[PDB]
Amino acid sequence: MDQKASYFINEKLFTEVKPVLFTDLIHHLKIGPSMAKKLMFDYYKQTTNAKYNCVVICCYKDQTIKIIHDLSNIPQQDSIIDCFIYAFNPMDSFIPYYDIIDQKDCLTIKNSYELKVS
Amino acid sequence: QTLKTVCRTCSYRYTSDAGIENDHIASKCNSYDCPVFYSRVKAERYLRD
Amino acid sequence: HMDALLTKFNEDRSLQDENLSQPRTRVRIVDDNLYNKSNPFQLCYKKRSQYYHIYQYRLKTFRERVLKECDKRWDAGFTLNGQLVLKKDKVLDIQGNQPCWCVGSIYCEMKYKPNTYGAPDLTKSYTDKEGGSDEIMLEDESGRVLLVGDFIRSTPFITGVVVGILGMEAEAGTFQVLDICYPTPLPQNPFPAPIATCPTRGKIALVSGLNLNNTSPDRLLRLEILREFLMGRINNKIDDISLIGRLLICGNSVDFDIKSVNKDELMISLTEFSKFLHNILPSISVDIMPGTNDPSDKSLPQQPFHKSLFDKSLESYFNGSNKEILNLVTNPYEFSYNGVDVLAVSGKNINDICKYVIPSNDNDIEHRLDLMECTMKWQNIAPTAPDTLWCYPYTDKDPFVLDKWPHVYIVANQPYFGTRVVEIGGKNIKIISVPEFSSTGMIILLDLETLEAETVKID
Amino acid sequence: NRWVEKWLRVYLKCYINLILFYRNVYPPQSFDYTTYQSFNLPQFVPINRHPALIDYIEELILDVLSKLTHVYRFSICIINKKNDLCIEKYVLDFSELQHVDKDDQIITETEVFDEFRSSLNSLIMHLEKLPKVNDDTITFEAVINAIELELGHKLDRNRRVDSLEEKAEIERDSNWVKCQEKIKLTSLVGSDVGPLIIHQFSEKL
Ligand code: SF4
């Protein structure tokens, strides 16, 4: 019932139109990447008049990791396990801009040598 | 490095096909009149700084 | 679509059974290389025409080096019906009909297929036909001899290659090629296994350089969108994070061309590199090296440029953490994991040989894979402008392609992926050719569990 | 100030040349997505290099920024070769500017670039969502709906000119002509950063 995420995605999609790639979701919720996949699926499931669809990355790998642009086709990933949905885009192309984000809360896997101020 | 490339392609006529000893013979070319040589002279004037 | 249905099917990983405010730290990385040695390839702090003295220094250093091995590590003179294999290098007594060990260096054909104050193309007429002929000349600095045989084209000893040749003499001018020599092995730096409580150690040689012109978004694509999240958020559920170690770029930090660039477009791509590296630095620690088209000396010993690759947000981390999370390292570096020594090359050192300066020695990934095998074996002068320093180029301690041998050499920016392993009498060496990122990436795990490499197609 | 009209110059470069790209007034193979045309762009904007044309574009932007308080609304007009009738009129604004106030505060570089990236991406969105029929035979011309201007008489009155800056200024007043003064109008999301209020819309026919 986590619609607390969904309206926050709704401003960034709509009231201004900069796309979320991943990092806004992890900044907002600090949910798991599997849970972020569930959330983006839920947004896709509860889509009402998306201006344009997202394209997914595919979890099934076979020594390949490809953003799908042959959406109907199955590009070398035939016996598919799963997909991780992200990069919901208003535009023709999928480009975000990239920025420093808060990560001390958000880092899923920390550094083998943690940084020291010294 | 472009001047050194020009100089070794100029100095290829004195080697048979070798390219690794081309650098010293390129550096020791001294014309009073060559349109890349003086630019290499001031290039090597810069690298001492 | 049914792609969403696959997510609907896979409800088993609700949250991957991670706490997710617990970071599970993966690697106990040792990195013995960082502090308690001088790096030979690195600059001189006091330091902070050249090439000529270096060439004789390589020739003499190899001459005493392989002078120890013509009969110690090769053919006994009791064979060949007592044909004398005594250590005469000059061609004055090579004309004696007994074949000796001809300890000399091949400079047969090295000039440029692609290109006018010096009138180059008129000179290059001599280049094309003679260079196309694959004939090999051996120079000990005392005279050329002809070479024919099968290993003329199969074994790519193109330039700077001190060998001892064995053939039935049969003419003063020419030999066949039955045998070559090598430098002696500088010895086995011990490969460890931490057998008690094995870490399942990190396994990484990922990035060949994120080649990033501002002029193209497609090179900007496949960084920061698939990567920085394969290290941490894009998941193989969950083993990809367990294999991945500490981030290794090799050269090519920002692609640009020098005659078209100015101040602010250099900082645009360098601050977006800062965005990438400060994005991935909480997740995975990084080791960075410039050297071919990112700013450099354009030499193999090349001073790595600190404080320019980073914005003010990221600038204070190298001040805060000295060499742990990131340090500036050169085009060669000996990354040692308590004796798993591995060597890096940004690629230009072999890519100029593989495409730019090659008219001969050609019988194309399986050809170019073995050029850096050769450059590993002889530890020799590959490129055309080496060591390229106004002060202290080489002080008889630090060859640009060094003398201490690694367990893996990294070379970069090839057309295709290539990863074999070959065993030599000294050690075992795995061949790593990580492709340039616009040529489909083919991004690689490296080593250190059973000395095994794993590429993944990033396209 | 000084930095704020640099931002206005980059924003108008992105706006103008992006309208030029999505109307196919120049061939798309000359365009490539980039961040550097003399400055730092917020987004990857498809820019053809063509140094006469980019000279024209930065010329026009340096013309519009030269007045900087008469203009309440910069705009882009779209004219066919077939008729002089307006095909689209893309709206932009110079309302409540920092530069007229000359307030030092506030820089907010990432925040102003954020709202600029939003307004650019909105321009992308409502430039693909109208279709592509008759994709060639379109041209470009500028229009400014401004509140209080007339500068074109400065060529006259027997003036004697000595400095290159006012040579440029006479070129600014020379290049601009008042014209003689609806069918559809579509919404566009503008930037709503504090000092730079750019309330940008679109018009159709
Ligand atoms: S400087 Fe000397 S070697 Fe170089 S191009 Fe001129 S004449 Fe030839």
Description:
This is part of a larger assembly, with chains A (118 residues), B (49 residues), C (459 residues) and D (205 residues). With 118 residues, chain A is mainly alpha-helical. Chain A has helices at residues 3-15, 23-29, 33-45; strands at 57-58, 83-84. Chain A has one domain (1-117). Chain A is globular, with a radius of gyration of 16 Å. Chain C has 459 residues and is α/β, with parallel strands linked by helices. Chain C has helices spanning 2-9, 50-67, 91-94, 120-132, 151-154, 217-220, 239-243, 263-280, 312-320, 348-356, 365-368, 371-378; strands at residues 102-106, 136-139, 146-147, 161-165, 174-175, 247-248, 286-287, 334-336, 341-344, 408-414, 421-423, 428-435, 443-445, 454-456. Chain D has five helices and nine strands, in the order H-E-E-H-E-E-H-H-E-H-E-E-E-E. In chain D, the strands form three sheets. Chain D has a five-stranded antiparallel beta sheet, with helices on one face. Chain D has a two-stranded antiparallel sheet with strand order 1-2. In chain D, strands 7-8 form a two-stranded antiparallel ribbon. In chain D, helix 1 packs across helix 2 (51-64) and helix 1 (3-22) runs parallel beside helix 4. At the A-C interface, helix 3, strand 1 and strand 2 of A face helix 1, helix 8, helix 9 and strand 14 of C. Residues 6-7, 10-11, 26, 29, 31, 34, 36-37 of chain B line the site of iron/sulfur cluster. Iron/sulfur cluster is lined by residues 6-7, 10-11, 26, 29, 31, 34, 36-37 of chain B.
